[PDB]
Design an enzyme around this catalytic site. Structure first.
Site, PDB file in Angstrom:
ATOM      1  N   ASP A 351       0.858  -1.176   0.000  1.00 39.99           N
ATOM      2  CA  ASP A 351       0.000   0.000   0.000  1.00 39.99           C
ATOM      3  C   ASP A 351       0.896   1.228   0.000  1.00 39.99           C
ATOM      4  OD1 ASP A 351      -2.689  -1.449   0.700  1.00 39.99           O
ATOM      5  OD2 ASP A 351      -1.295  -2.091   2.283  1.00 39.99           O
ATOM      6  N   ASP A 703      -4.341  -3.485   6.260  1.00 40.02           N
ATOM      7  CA  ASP A 703      -4.505  -2.752   7.511  1.00 40.02           C
ATOM      8  C   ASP A 703      -5.831  -3.100   8.179  1.00 40.02           C
ATOM      9  OD1 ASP A 703      -4.535  -0.963   9.616  1.00 40.02           O
ATOM     10  OD2 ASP A 703      -3.829   0.746   8.425  1.00 40.02           O
ATOM     11  N   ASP A 707      -8.804  -6.457   4.217  1.00 36.33           N
ATOM     12  CA  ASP A 707      -7.528  -6.923   3.703  1.00 36.33           C
ATOM     13  C   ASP A 707      -7.215  -8.317   4.240  1.00 36.33           C
ATOM     14  OD1 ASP A 707      -7.061  -4.491   2.325  1.00 36.33           O
ATOM     15  OD2 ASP A 707      -6.303  -3.573   4.170  1.00 36.33           O
TER      16      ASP A 707
END
Ligand SMILES: C/C=C(\C)C(=O)O[C@H]1C(C)=C2[C@H]([C@@H]1OC(=O)CCCCCCC)[C@@](C)(OC(C)=O)C[C@H](O)[C@@]1(O)[C@H]2OC(=O)[C@@]1(C)O
Ligand SMILES: [K+]
Ligand SMILES: [Mg+2]
Length: 994
Positions: A351, A703, A707
């Site tokens: 990310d 996070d 996910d």
């Protein structure tokens, strides 16, 4: 159940046939409960000791070991009460190893934490509902909540199940979906339905998800789905459905013991035919009972020799300090086995905002209109200083200091930033640094207005605490804010409605201040504001505007651009409805563009070099970000993922593009792609699947709970330290600093640790191989036992273990990160090496059996049948006149075994050095390169002496110290090993390949 977001309030109530006023009747409950089951997530996998401990004993290598113990145990009942008190030691030792490892396994599982269980923390025990039974609200167990039920929620409450919001009693309703995305920021909810049936969670504004907290307000809602059907429940199903392959190593060992089984059985077969002539033997039966015990005691001794008992320990120990080692580097590794897979990674998808960048925002540039005359158009471009949120900066045009008050474009632009802003700035006394109160992007706006106070209100004297919000407060005084139109993704902009506060300024009436994505909001602008004046928007101006925006977003700057505008003549407040986000875009129209602001989310200093490391390392890095493709690509070229002039057309994708792509082209893009922009939740799981289709060992960063299904899928899920508890439990490792570089660093250790680990493994396997040979030679020739199992254990457990552990400390190669990631398939021992350890093993085999033999004959201390058939040693007592002109109990003597044992130990300390490197001569690669190895070597020998000299031990072991002279015989037998390996270590790196 249903897709309630698309449905209307009335439709949902109609579906379940429930009254909003009364709720569900007790009957409807009975039916609904039976049909939809309970509002709960399924039970934990039923494990028990009696189920746990059996898995401990279901690996082949533990089973044959167990079997061996019994035989020895049985054999030890046949031992004369006088012949040996210690007969029962041998079997015990095996068992207490099996019990020890069994013990180890269970403690690890008891501690291990399931990721699915982490979801339960989001389950509230209680919830409040309206039912036919009572007018008053009743508080019940969330578990008993059913779909179609009327639910009541208020601040602080944890949402029991997925709920469609029927009506909101509070003036405003805010929810905290951080458990989901990791964002603490609250979100406004509305009653009006969402038209799209496939709308992602983020856009279900009329929805409440189980597990979330209510930030503010109170609301009433109908239960859409419960239990497994909820968004969180669906996520659990994905995780339950997901399966994890065993670490490549793990896979190897299983095949090792697998093959080892066959080899073992094969040896017995061969051993049996070698002694097949025994069928051509007297039928007197004499000694027949005796022959069996010998073959059986050979069987057990064989087993222990084949298996590397000490290995498990040696490995786990090595991984443990390696783990603590990584912890120092901000890399927290949960589960040790993942360390290997960590070195093998070929693709890592990170990310952007969290890891790759600081997530520290500041405004660098901004522009406003200067002069619009016919086709001719000029704009005012500014540059601001200060990367911190700290109001310590300067505004300059063409690098020259400027007082913002000079420009009327700035005064209006500045009011927008402060007024159309929810977030604030707070100063902390403890750390002595300015901290953002709300959103990163918004906070940097509040930051900006400070540096450029267009009113130049004096604040130099003001305390740092009071400084943080000074210039903003002054703007808050100017205009009273009636209300705000929150951001929605459809229009990608937010607005505020403001009545001019106070009589002195009480003119022009109420005004709207809107900020959002340049493209979107600029289309709504029909006018542009130059200073105080305002001019109708025309093509040429709009182009010059968009042009600079592209330059700022796609250029070397890679800035995020916001378009700021005001509605000079907003609609009458009464004509406005503030409960529907759909009407918001039409409120924000006929705008007057004042100016745009460009801000930067700076990459981490460590990142650039860490990316290069991956190029050198052969690791492919894939970026996941929220920015529009254009700038996303720009950021990639800025960190080195792409070349400045490198073509990217087919390597960059957005969720939309990816979705449009067919399955074949999708899979194909994954091998090519290095940048995904505007990604949808499902994709992470998809991408992983695809990367795995090419056998790529992939890493994923997540996070939130969404996910999770991905982190559990990817070979190595990586979670943030700031991450939700669930995200962490599903991942393999956690980044404390959340830094991307920390990821790369871990892979280096993953490769480094594996290399040494590889060496000490072959080293342990080789010793085993050699031990098996000796045993086999002993059996085939009919020789007396050169080595007893008890001895072997000690050697494999301790004598071998210490040098093996020391080998784990081998100095790392310089080119670790210059070589491509290791192939999970590649075997530890194959081709030439296999042949090497094949030969070496044979040498130690002959050496041990021979050393014991050299004592029985050609030895001064020992009575020798020089070159006679001592082999038929079974028949001494009965056949002693024939050939046996001496005592026959002599074969029991310890001296030969210690002789054979000693040579083994000595050979093993040598072989340990030969294992310092695979193909490097010791003069090229001294033993003193690794102090620990030499240090451990000395230790193992000391211990070896100990067992010989201390009273209780040598008896137990069946060893007796040997004269200095006898020692030398060992050396003449063992030392030549190094030469042997050195020669096989001179064929490869020259005449073979390499
Ligand atoms: C004592 C250990 C025993 C039996 C034992 O280990 O048996 C064999 C075996 C499992 C392997 C072979 C052994 O072959 C022999 O030693 C043949 C012995 C013939 C004895 C003759 C009796 C009649 C290894 C060890 O051998 C050498 C050194 O290369 C190499 C390597 O680790 C493996 O190939 C391994 O299987 C694998 O999956 C590998 C890739 O790990
Ligand atoms: K995994
Ligand atoms: Mg997310």
């Amino acid at each position: 159940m249903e897709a309630a977001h698309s449905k209307s309030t009335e439709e949902c109530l109609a579906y379940f046939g429930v009254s909003e006023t009364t709720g569900l009747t007790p009957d409807q409950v009975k039916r609904h409960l039976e049909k939809y089951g309970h509002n709960e997530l399924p039970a934990e996998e039923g494990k028990s000791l009696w189920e746990l401990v059996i898995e401990q004993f279901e690996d082949l290598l533990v089973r044959i070991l167990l079997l061996a113990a019994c035989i020895s145990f049985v054999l030890a009942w046949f031992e004369e009460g006088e012949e040996t008190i210690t007969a029962f030691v041998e079997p015990f030792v095996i068992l207490l190893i099996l019990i020890a490892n069994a013990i180890v396994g269970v403690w690890q599982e008891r501690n291990a934490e399931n990721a699915i269980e982490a979801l339960k923390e989001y389950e509230p025990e209680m919830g409040k509902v309206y039912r036919a039974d009572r007018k008053s609200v009743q508080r019940i167990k969330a578990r008993d909540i059913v779909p179609g039920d009327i639910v009541e929620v208020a601040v602080g409450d944890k949402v029991p199940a997925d709920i469609r919001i029927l009506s909101i009693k509070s003036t405003t309703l805010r929810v905290d979906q951080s458990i989901l995305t990791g964002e603490s920021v609250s979100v406004i909810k509305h009653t009006e339905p969402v038209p799209d049936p496939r709308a992602v969670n983020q856009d279900k504004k009329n929805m409440l998800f189980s597990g979330t907290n209510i930030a503010a307000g109170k609301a009433l809602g109908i239960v859409a789905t419960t239990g497994v059907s909820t968004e969180i429940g669906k996520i659990r199903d994905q995780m339950a459905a997901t399966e994890q392959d065993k670490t490549p190593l793990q896979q190897k060992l299983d095949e090792f013991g697998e093959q080892l089984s066959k080899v073992i059985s094969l040896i017995c077969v061969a051993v049996w035919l070698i002694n097949i002539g025994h069928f051509n033997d007297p039928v007197h039966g004499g000694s027949w009972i005796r022959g069996a015990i010998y073959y059986f005691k050979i069987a057990v001794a064989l087993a222990v020799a084949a298996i590397p008992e000490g290995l498990p320990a040696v490995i786990t120990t090595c991984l443990a300090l390696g783990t603590r080692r990584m912890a120092k580097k901000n890399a927290i590794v949960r589960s040790l086995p993942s360390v290997e897979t960590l070195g093998c990674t070929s693709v890592i998808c990170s990310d952007k905002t969290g890891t790759l960048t600081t997530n520290q925002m500041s405004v660098c540039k901004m522009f406003i209109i200067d002069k619009v005359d016919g086709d001719f158009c000029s704009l005012n471009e500014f540059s601001i200083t200060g990367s911190t949120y700290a109001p310590e900066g300067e505004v300059l045009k063409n690098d020259k200091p400027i007082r913002s008050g000079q420009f009327d474009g700035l005064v209006e632009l500045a009011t927008i930033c402060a007024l159309c802003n929810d977030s604030s700035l707070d100063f902390n006394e403890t750390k002595g640094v300015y901290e953002k109160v709300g959103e990163a992007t918004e906070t940097a706006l509040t930051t900006l207005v400070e540096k450029m106070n267009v009113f130049n209100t004096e604040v130099r004297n003001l305390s740092k605490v009071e400084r943080a919000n000074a210039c903003n407060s002054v703007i808050r005084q100017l205009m009273k804010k009636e209300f705000t139109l929150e951001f929605s993704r459809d229009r990608k902009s937010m607005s505020v409605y403001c009545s001019p506060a106070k009589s002195s300024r009480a003119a022009v009436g109420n005004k709207m201040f809107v900020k959002g994505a340049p493209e979107g909001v600029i289309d709504r602008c029909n006018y542009v504001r130059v200073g105080t004046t305002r001019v109708p928007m025309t093509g040429p101006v709009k182009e010059k505007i968009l042009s600079v925006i592209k330059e700022w977003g796609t250029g070397r700057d890679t800035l995020r651009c916001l378009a700021l505008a005001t509605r000079d003549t907003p609609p009458k407040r009464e004509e406005m409805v503030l409960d529907d986000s759909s009407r918001f875009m039409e409120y924000e129209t006929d705008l007057t563009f004042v100016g745009v602001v460009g801000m930067l989310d700076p990459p981490r200093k460590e990142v650039m070099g860490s990316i290069q490391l991956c190029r050198d390392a052969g690791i492919r890095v894939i970026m996941i970000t929220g920015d529009n493709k254009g700038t996303a690509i720009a950021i990639c070229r800025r960190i080195g993922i792409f070349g400045e002039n490198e073509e990217v057309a087919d390597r960059a994708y957005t969720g939309r593009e990816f979705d449009d792509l067919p399955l074949a082209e999708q899979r194909e893009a994954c091998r090519r792609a290095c940048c995904f922009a505007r990604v949808e939740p499902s994709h992470k799981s998809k991408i992983v699947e695809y990367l795995q289709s090419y056998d790529e060992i992939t890493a994923m960063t997540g996070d939130g709970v969404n996910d999770a299904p991905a982190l559990k899928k990817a070979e190595i899920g990586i979670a943030m330290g700031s991450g939700t508890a669930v995200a962490k439990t599903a991942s393999e490792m956690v980044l404390a600093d959340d830094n991307f570089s920390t990821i790369v660093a871990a892979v280096e250790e993953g490769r480094a640790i594996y290399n040494n680990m590889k060496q000490f493994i072959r080293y342990l396997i080789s010793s085993n191989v050699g031990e098996v040979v000796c045993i086999f030679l002993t059996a085939a020739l009919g020789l007396p036992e050169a080595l007893i199992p008890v001895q072997l254990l000690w050697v494999n457990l301790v004598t071998d273990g210490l040098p093996a552990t020391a080998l784990g400390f081998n100095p790392p190669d310089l080119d670790i990160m210059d070589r491509p990631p290791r192939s999970p398939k590649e075997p530890l021992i194959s081709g030439w090496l296999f042949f090497r350890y094949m030969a070496i093993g044979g040498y130690v085999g002959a050496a041990t059996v021979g050393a014991a033999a050299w004592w029985f004959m050609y030895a001064e201390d020992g009575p020798g049948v020089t070159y006679h058939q001592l082999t038929h040693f079974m028949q001494c007592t009965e056949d002693h006149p024939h050939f046996e002109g001496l005592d026959c109990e002599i074969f029991e003597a310890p001296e030969p075994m210690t002789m054979a044992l000693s040579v083994l130990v000595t050979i093993e300390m040598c072989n340990a050095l030969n294992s310092l490197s695979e193909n490097q001569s010791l003069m090229r690669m001294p033993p003193w390169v690794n102090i620990w190895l030499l240090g451990s070597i000395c230790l193992s020998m000391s211990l070896h002496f100990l067992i010989l000299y201390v009273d209780p031990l040598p008896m137990i072991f069946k060893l007796k110290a040997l004269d200095l002279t006898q020692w030398l015989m060992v050396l003449k037998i063992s030392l030549p090993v190094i030469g042997l390996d050195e020669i096989l270590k001179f064929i490869a790196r020259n005449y073979l390949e390499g």
